[PDB]
Amino acid sequence: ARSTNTFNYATYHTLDEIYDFMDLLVAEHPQLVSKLQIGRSYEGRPIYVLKFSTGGSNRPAIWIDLGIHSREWITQATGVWFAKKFTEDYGQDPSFTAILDSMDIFLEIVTNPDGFAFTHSQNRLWRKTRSVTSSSLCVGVDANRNWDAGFGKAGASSSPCSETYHGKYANSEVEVKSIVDFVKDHGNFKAFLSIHSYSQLLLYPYGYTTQSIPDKTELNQVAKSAVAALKSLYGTSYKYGSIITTIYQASGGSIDWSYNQGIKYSFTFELRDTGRYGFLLPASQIIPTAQETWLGVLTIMEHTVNN
Ligand SMILES: [Cu+2]
Ligand SMILES: [Hg+2]
Ligand SMILES: [Hg+2]
Ligand SMILES: [Hg+2]
Ligand SMILES: [Hg+2]
């Protein structure tokens, strides 16, 4: 509220409160975090990424996005918890400290701000962007079907009213283009994590093709390790594997894109729960979710630093 220390992390918040939170954080930790705007949403809301760094120029970096599917509120809540945690742990946690001493971390807490507002205003379950058009009264695109990785293949719908509509062409949604251009311009990303809910899964590419990635042994070992760390705190059980073998065929997904850009450590997390509450996870599960996900994420970052 008046300081990140008084912000209530154990409750869900609106867009404005999250945006306010970002400014407070930057104000409190100017030497570590900065707020960059990498685009504007369809309805004109700024799209912000927090950059965490101890210096250097173009250091290898880690991208983390949350909330691309707006109704997955647990994700934006986890994103705010992570932002705070980074600032607390630097200097206290040996491992994390080593990570930030050598790499920068870019965190996008609200990747789909128009959808997020819509979830507070009109439809709690809204998943897509809010882009409109012409040959349909249906609004919106599945931003996780809009990337240029098997765009348009099986695993996405071409019907505008579908929950999985892929949109007119790859990267047609501003919310996606913005990340694409930012990552391509930076050119030094080593890891790309996209956070979703629900199902308790840790996935690696690909989703659009049965073809195995060349780094499959390593990512799989990574995922296994991360899942082991994550389970350690509360016993939360995750499965892991490639998107297509674990879930279903899905095209135009972000991690397929990042992996094809050469960002080896590309993974998607599907947070709690397994169906009991689904998207409507109680506020009381915020903190435990966030704490256990951190362990998983930290294990991937460690791997990254050392490889
Ligand atoms: Cu899923
Ligand atoms: Hg600080
Ligand atoms: Hg702080
Ligand atoms: Hg999702
Ligand atoms: Hg805490």
CATH number at residue 90: 3.40.630.10
Does 248 count as an annotated binding residue? yes
Strand partners, 105: 52, 62
Structure-token pair, residue 274: 């397994």
Beta strand pairing call for 33-40 and 46-52: antiparallel
Backbone angles phi, psi at 85, to 5 degrees: -55, -40
Does 303 count as an annotated binding residue? no
Q: Quote the number of domains for the chain.
A: 1
Ligand with an atom nearest the CA of residue 25: 3
- For ligand 3, the distance from its centroid to the CA atom of residue 260, given in whole angstroms, is 36
Query: How big is the CA angle at 66 (ends 65 and 72), to the nearest 5 degrees?
Result: 160
Q: Which residues are catalytic?
A: 270
- For ligand 1, the distance from its centroid to the CA atom of residue 218, given in whole angstroms, is 23
Ligand with an atom nearest the CA of residue 100: 2
What is the residue-wise DSSP string for 222-276? Answer: HHHHHHHHHHHHH----EEEEHHHHT----S-HHHHHHHTT--EEEEEEES-SSS
Does 69 count as an annotated binding residue? yes
Q: What is the 3-state secondary structure (H, E, C) of 179-203?
A: HHHHHHHHCCEEEEEEEEECCCEEE
Determined by X-ray
Residue listed under structure tokens 């689904």? 278
Q: What is the dihedral of CA 111, 112, 116, 118, to 10 degrees?
A: 170
What are the C-alpha distances in Å from 159 to residues 26, 79, 133, 149, 155?
42, 31, 13, 19, 12
What are the C-alpha distances in Å from 166 to residues 131, 152, 177, 260, 266?
12, 7, 14, 19, 21
Resolution (A): 1.8
**For the packed helices 73-89 and 15-28, what is the interaxial angle rounded to 10 degrees?**
10
- For ligand 1, the distance from its centroid to the CA atom of residue 90, given in whole angstroms, is 32
- Measured distance CA(66)–CA(211) in Å, rounded: 27
- Measured distance CA(305)–CA(239) in Å, rounded: 24
Which structural domain, as residue segments, surrounds residue 298? 1-307
